[PDB]
Amino acid sequence: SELDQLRQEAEQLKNQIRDARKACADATLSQITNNIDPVGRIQMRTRRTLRGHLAKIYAMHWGTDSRLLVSASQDGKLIIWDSYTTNKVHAIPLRSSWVMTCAYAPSGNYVACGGLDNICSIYNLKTREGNVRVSRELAGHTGYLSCCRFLDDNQIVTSSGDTTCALWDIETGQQTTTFTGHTGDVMSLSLAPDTRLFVSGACDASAKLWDVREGMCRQTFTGHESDINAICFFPNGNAFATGSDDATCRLFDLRADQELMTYSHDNIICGITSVSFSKSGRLLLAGYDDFNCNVWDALKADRAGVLAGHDNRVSCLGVTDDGMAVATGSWDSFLKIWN
Amino acid sequence: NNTASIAQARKLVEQLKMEANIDRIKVSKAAADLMAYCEAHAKEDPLLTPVPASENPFREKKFF
Amino acid sequence: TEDRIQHALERCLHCLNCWSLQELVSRDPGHFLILLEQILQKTREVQEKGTYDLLAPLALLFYSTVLCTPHFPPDSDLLLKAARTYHRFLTWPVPYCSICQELLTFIDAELKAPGISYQRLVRAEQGLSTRSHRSSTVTVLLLNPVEVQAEFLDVADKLSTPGPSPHSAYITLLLHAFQATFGAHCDLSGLHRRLQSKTLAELEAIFTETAEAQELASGIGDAAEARQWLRTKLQAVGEKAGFPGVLDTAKPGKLRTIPIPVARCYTYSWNQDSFDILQEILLKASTLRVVVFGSDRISGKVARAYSNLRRLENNRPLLTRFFKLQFFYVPVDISHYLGMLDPWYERNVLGLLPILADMLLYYCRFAARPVLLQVYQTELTFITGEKTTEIFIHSLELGHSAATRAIKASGPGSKRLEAVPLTLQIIYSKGAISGRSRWSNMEKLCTSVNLSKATEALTLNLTEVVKRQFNQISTSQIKVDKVQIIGSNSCPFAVCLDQDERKILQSVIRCEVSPCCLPIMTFS
Amino acid sequence: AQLLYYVNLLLIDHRFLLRHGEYVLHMWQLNADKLTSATNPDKENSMSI
Numbered sequence: 001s002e003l004d005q006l007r008q009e010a011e012q013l014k015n016q017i018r019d020a021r022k023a024c025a026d027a028t029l030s031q032i033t034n035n036i037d038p039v040g041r042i043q044m045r046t047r048r049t050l051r052g053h054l055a056k057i058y059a060m061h062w063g064t065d066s067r068l069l070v071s072a073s074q075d076g077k078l079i080i081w082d083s084y085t086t087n088k089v090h091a092i093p094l095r096s097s098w099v100m101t102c103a104y105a106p107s108g109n110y111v112a113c114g115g116l117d118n119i120c121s122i123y124n125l126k127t128r129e130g131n132v133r134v135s136r137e138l139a140g141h142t143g144y145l146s147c148c149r150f151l152d153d154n155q156i157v158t159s160s161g162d163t164t165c166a167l168w169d170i171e172t173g174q175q176t177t178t179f180t181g182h183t184g185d186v187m188s189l190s191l192a193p194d195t196r197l198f199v200s201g202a203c204d205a206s207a208k209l210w211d212v213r214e215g216m217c218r219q220t221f222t223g224h225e226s227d228i229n230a231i232c233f234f235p236n237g238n239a240f241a242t243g244s245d246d247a248t249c250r251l252f253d254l255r256a257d258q259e260l261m262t263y264s265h266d267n268i269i270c271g272i273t274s275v276s277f278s279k280s281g282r283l284l285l286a287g288y289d290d291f292n293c294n295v296w297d298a299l300k301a302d303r304a305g306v307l308a309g310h311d312n313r314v315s316c317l318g319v320t321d322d323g324m325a326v327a328t329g330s331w332d333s334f335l336k337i338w339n
Numbered sequence: 340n341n342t343a344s345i346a347q348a349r350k351l352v353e354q355l356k357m358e359a360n361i362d363r364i365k366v367s368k369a370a371a372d373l374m375a376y377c378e379a380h381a382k383e384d385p386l387l388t389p390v391p392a393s394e395n396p397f398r399e400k401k402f403f
Numbered sequence: 404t405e406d407r408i409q410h411a412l413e414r415c416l417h418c419l420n421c422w423s424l425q426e427l428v429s430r431d432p433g434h435f436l437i438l439l440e441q442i443l444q445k446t447r448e449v450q451e452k453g454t455y456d457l458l459a460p461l462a463l464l465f466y467s468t469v470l471c472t473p474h475f476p477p478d479s480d481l482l483l484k485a486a487r488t489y490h491r492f493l494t495w496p497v498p499y500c501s502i503c504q505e506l507l508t509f510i511d512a513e514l515k516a517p518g519i520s521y522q523r524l525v526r527a528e529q530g531l532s533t534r535s536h537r538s539s540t541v542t543v544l545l546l547n548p549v550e551v552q553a554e555f556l557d558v559a560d561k562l563s564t565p566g567p568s569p570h571s572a573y574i575t576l577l578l579h580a581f582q583a584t585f586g587a588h589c590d591l592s593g594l595h596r597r598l599q600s601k602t603l604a605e606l607e608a609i610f611t612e613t614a615e616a617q618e619l620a621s622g623i624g625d626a627a628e629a630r631q632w633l634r635t636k637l638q639a640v641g642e643k644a645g646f647p648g649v650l651d652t653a654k655p656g657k658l659r660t661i662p663i664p665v666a667r668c669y670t671y672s673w674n675q676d677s678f679d680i681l682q683e684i685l686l687k688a689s690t691l692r693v694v695v696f697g698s699d700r701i702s703g704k705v706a707r708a709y710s711n712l713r714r715l716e717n718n719r720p721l722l723t724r725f726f727k728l729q730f731f732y733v734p735v736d737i738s739h740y741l742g743m744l745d746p747w748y749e750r751n752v753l754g755l756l757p758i759l760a761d762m763l764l765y766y767c768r769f770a771a772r773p774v775l776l777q778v779y780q781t782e783l784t785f786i787t788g789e790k791t792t793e794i795f796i797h798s799l800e801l802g803h804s805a806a807t808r809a810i811k812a813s814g815p816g817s818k819r820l821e822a823v824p825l826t827l828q829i830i831y832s833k834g835a836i837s838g839r840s841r842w843s844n845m846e847k848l849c850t851s852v853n854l855s856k857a858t859e860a861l862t863l864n865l866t867e868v869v870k871r872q873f874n875q876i877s878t879s880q881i882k883v884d885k886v887q888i889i890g891s892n893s894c895p896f897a898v899c900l901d902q903d904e905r906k907i908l909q910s911v912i913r914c915e916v917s918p919c920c921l922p923i924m925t926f927s
Numbered sequence: 928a929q930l931l932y933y934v935n936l937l938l939i940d941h942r943f944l945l946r947h948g949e950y951v952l953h954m955w956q957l958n959a960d961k962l963t964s965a966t967n968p969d970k971e972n973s974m975s976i
Contacts, residue, residue, distance in 0.1 A: 096909070278386040
């Protein structure tokens with residue numbers, strides 16, 4: 001009675017959402033972008049190599065300065081590199097060797113990491129004595145910490161395997177907000193240029209737009225046939241792309257609340273590990289589980305190029321705030337900068 | 340075991356009401372907007388258009 | 404009949420034969436006295452020839468038989484003859500004298516009170532309690548659907564069904580109680596019909612007034628007097644009850660094998676390895692029987708939950724405040740280890756309503772010999788300084804193997820996720836049979852360390868790396884009982900206990916090893 | 928078979944009982960010598976059975 005009427009209300013509102021979206025589905029992005037001149041071939045070269053990690057590299061994140069970058073690796077270490085000089089600005093050993101994510105703070109003073117410890121350990125680079133001291137252990141998550149991004153020196157969003165995200169205030173060590181709703185492990189998240197919104201991708205093969213301010217799910221996007229491993233915003237902040245274990249990426253617009261474009265090829269059979277946009281967004285850099293890192297024309301959906309500089313899975317990748325270079329960490333124990 | 344299924348099914352329907360209560364925009368305009376954004380910021384993207392080697396920090400200088 | 408029973412017995416102590424023989428005897432009550440006499444004779448063939456081997460099976464057979472024999476002739480010498488037969492074993496090693504003293508106590512109970520053993524056993528099994536003497540032996544079954552086998556699942560489903568009823572149970576118990584004492588002077592049908600017409604409450608008042616004399620007569624020195632004074636007690640009861648003439652009839656009322664009403668069997672699915680399921684079930688003078696199916700991997704989990712539950716309830720007795728725990732292992736590496744050791748286990752219960760469920764409602768009622776493996780107490784230390792002594796029971800691991808296990812057991816993580824050697828200090832005591840331990844100390848560059856089974860001994864697979872690059876590996880097994888591993892804070896290692904990934908541990912700087920109610924059982 | 932060790936042990940004891948349990952004995956090495964009923968005092972380099 002009450003549950004069957006509520007189930008049919010759910011399944012009616014769902015087709016109301018499908019019709020509200022199909023109404024806006026007047027034209028595709030491949031049609032509109034047919035006319036514009038193709039991007040051509042993005043011939044990329046390995047500029048730097050960042051050696052020193054003893055095992056698989058699990059994560060990396062550029063600093064807002066475009067020069068420094070953190071990287072977490074299977075060897076239990078979190079290294080801060082100066083991409084320009086190849087020297088290790090820091091080699092922080094972690095209390096838990098099972099690190100999976102890292103995030104350079106926009107200020108550059110703080111760095112965050114986490115993993116199966118279910119804790120978001122925040123470290124301070126500019127310490128009283130100048131050492132690499134642990135500022136906080138943001139604990140409370142009931143699953144492995146899958147990803148996190150600093151809002152500021154004192155605020156940080158983290159995703160976890162409990163099917164939730166959470167905003168923390170580093171000072172109090174307490175979950176300011178908790179973003180519940182996912183039905184699978186949240187693999188990734190990404191703060192919008194406007195810090196009031198962020199999207200998150202999960203193993204439920206769907207993405208969700210969250211409001212940092214309030215803490216409610218505003219929109220939910222689907223289309224992927226497998227787990228979503230990585231997600232990030234379009235430079236402007238009105239769209240975001242998701243990579244999935246179905247060997248496909250997809251673009252979603254928030255204002256249109258539906259999929260715009262699919263990036264896949266019959267040759268491409270392995271899943272996507274990571275994604276990133278260029279400063280303008282014309283280029284989408286997708287990491288794969290075949291040692292490759294394909295460059296797509298975000299508008300044409302054509303595979304413009306390929307970055308093949310790694311012997312093992314291209315686990316992680318990033319782009320500088322100025323888009324001047326592309327970093328790609330991999331399981332071969334080496335990161336590689338590209339231009 | 341209804342108090343859980345109902346409390347869950349209510350969140351679902353209260354969530355689906357949230358998502359459906361948004362003024363969406365035509366996909367055509369979403370694309371036009373994104374295309375004209377890239378068109379606007381295409382010059383300031385060194386990945387799209389190769390910049391001179393002098394401006395590249397990773398190929399022309401070792402001192403920084 | 405006589406020769407068939409004797410030859411089937413010759414087959415019985417040489418896999419389902421035990422059952423073939425319990426059934427054959429169950430047909431006509433006569434067979435029971437034949438088998439009993441034959442057993443006795445054979446046990447004197449041993450009392451005089453040797454071969455200790457054959458005392459345990461024969462004691463079990465006598466116990467099982469006499470336990471259900473519908474009635475013994477008042478003039479029969481079988482029990483006194485048996486007493487004289489087993490009163491000559493005290494000059495044997497332990498435990499033979501223990502087995503025989505217990506059996507002689509059982510024979511004492513028989514003479515002093517007929518049918519006392521069966522009535523006590525069942526009243527425990529059926530959960531029926533006198534206002535004074537309360538008894539409950541509830542068998543609960545633990546089964547993981549995908550690990551257990553179809554037939555076995557059917558057995559569990561049938562056992563879960565409450566076959567017997569309290570009123571039917573009371574009827575059956577009063578039947579056996581009157582037929583063990585009166586026997587052929589009691590017409591079963593007669594009583595049974597002057598019984599079904601009655602009510603549960605009065606059937607209880609009676610079965611209680613009966614069991615009480617079944618005890619008070621057992622606890623008297625004149626077994627023969629106690630006996631006739633118990634026939635007399637039951638007579639004086641049955642007169643009031645209202646079925647006079649049914650008993651003490653000059654006709655040769657026939658005897659028949661009253662069965663054993665199955666015990667209260669509950670099934671609970673095991674989508675778990677911890678024994679918190681047992682406490683949760685509890686949340687829903689007595690004993691509890693837990694029966695579990697033995698898979699290969701499950702081994703480790705099972706023994707680790709054994710250890711965890713023991714230490715937890717040692718911290719606070721909760722499951723041991725009203726029930727005594729009895730855990731049974733059923734095969735479906737420890738299975739192989741026990742398979743070749745005990746020929747009785749390999750004959751009766753290794754191989755295995757239906758036959759399977761009779762031999763499982765049989766095995767579970769008799770076997771009372773706990774054979775336990777040496778639990779190994781190990782205290783670890785971390786960089787944080789956490790110290791606790793949790794046990795492993797099959798093998799231990801350390802190095803890169805445990806890390807590999809976690810690497811693949813991560814699922815979501817295992818989809819998004821060389822053995823660097825470990826400069827560790829090894830201090831192991833090569834045990835001596837005479838008690839003169841020999842210490843030997845090294846520090847070696849080893850990658851992984853794997854404690855494996857051989858007071859008991861522990862073999863330890865060492866993985867030495869003489870050189871890094873495809874690390875070199877020189878695996879050597881060395882017997883050791885007390886082993887101390889010291890690892891620098893800057894060299895934490897992935898330690899796994901019992902080969903279960905759920906207990907893969909990191910950050911350990913030190914690992915101490917040394918060999919150390921709820922029993923697990925072995926048939927013989 | 929060139930004798931290399933020996934040791935002895937009474938079966939009944941001084942107090943009229945039989946010996947029962949585990950026994951560890953230290954052997955002498957090689958008359959009235961072979962009838963001795965005491966254990967070697969060398970507890971740290973003697974053969975123990």
